[PDB]
Structure 1
Amino acid sequence: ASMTARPLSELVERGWAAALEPVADQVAHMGQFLRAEIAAGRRYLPAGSNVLRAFTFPFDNVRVLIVGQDPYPTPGHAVGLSFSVAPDVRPWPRSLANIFDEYTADLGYPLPSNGDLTPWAQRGVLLLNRVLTVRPSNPASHRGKGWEAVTECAIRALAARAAPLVAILWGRDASTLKPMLAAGNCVAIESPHPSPLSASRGFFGSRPFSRANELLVGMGAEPIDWRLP
Structure 2
Amino acid sequence: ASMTARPLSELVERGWAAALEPVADQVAHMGQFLRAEIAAGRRYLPAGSNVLRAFTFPFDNVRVLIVGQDPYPTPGHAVGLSFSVAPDVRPWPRSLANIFDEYTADLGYPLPSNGDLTPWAQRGVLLLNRVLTVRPSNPASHRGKGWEAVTECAIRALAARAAPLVAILWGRDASTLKPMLAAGNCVAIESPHPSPLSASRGFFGSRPFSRANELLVGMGAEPIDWRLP
Give the alignment's TM-score, normalised by structure 1: 1.00
Mapping 1:61-100, distance limit 5 Å: 61-100=61-100
Shift in Å, 1:226: 0.0
Return the offset for 1:67. Answer: 0.1
Q: Give 1:177 deviation, angstroms.
A: 0.1
**CA shift at 1:54, angstroms?**
0.1
Deviation at 1:124, TM superposition (A): 0.3
SS of the residue corresponding to residue 166 of structure 2 reads strand
Total equivalences in the alignment: 229
Give deviations 1:56-113, integer Å, cap 9, x for gaps: 0000000000000000000000000000000000000000000000000000000000
1:228 deviates by 0.1
**Which secondary structure does the structure 1 equivalent of 2:168 belong to?**
strand
Distance 2:162 2:215 in 1: 16
Partner of 1:45: 45
d(CA) in 2 for partners of 1:81 and 1:48? 13
2-structure distance, mates of 1:33, 1:218: 42
| Deviation, structure 1 residue 188 | 0.1
Identity of aligned residues (%): 100
1:28 deviates by 0.0
Q: TM-score, normalised by structure 2?
A: 1.00
Q: Following the alignment from structure 2 to structure 1, what is the Cα–Cα distance between the partners of residues 201 and 138?
A: 23
**Deviations along 1:106-134, whole A, 9 cap, x unmatched?**
00000000000000000000000000000
CA distance in 2, matches of 1:35, 1:225: 39
Structure 2, gaps ≥5 residues long = none
Give the 3-state SS of the residue equivalent to 2:189 in structure 1.
strand
Q: Aligned partners of 2:189 and 2:87: how far apart in 1?
A: 28
Give the secondary-structure state (helix, strand or coil) at the position aligned to 1:106.
helix
Residue 225 of structure 1, CA deviation: 0.1
SS at 1:169 equivalent: strand
In the alignment, the residues of structure 2 paired with residue 220 and residue 68 of structure 1 have an alpha-carbon distance, to the nearest angstrom, of 26
Q: Deviations over 1:178-229 (max 9, x none)?
A: 0000000000000000000000000000000000000000000000000000
Aligned-pair distance for 1:139?
0.2
**Structure 2: distance between partners of 1:137 and 1:90:** 18
Q: Distance in 2 between matches of 1:8 and 1:43?
A: 23
Q: Note the C-alpha offset of 1:9.
A: 0.1
| Partner SS, residue 148 of structure 2 | helix
The corresponding residue for 2:168 is 168
Gaps of 5+ in 1: none
Instruction: Return the offset for 1:148.
Output: 0.0
1:26 aligns to what SS in structure 2?
helix
CA drift at 1:15: 0.1
Structure 1 residues 145-204: Cα deviation after superposition (integer angstroms, max 9, x where no partner): 000000000000000000000000000000000000000000000000000000000000
Aligned equivalent of 2:199: 199
Q: CA RMSD in A?
A: 0.1
SS in 1 for 2:89: coil
Which 4+ runs in 1 deviate beyond 2 A?
none
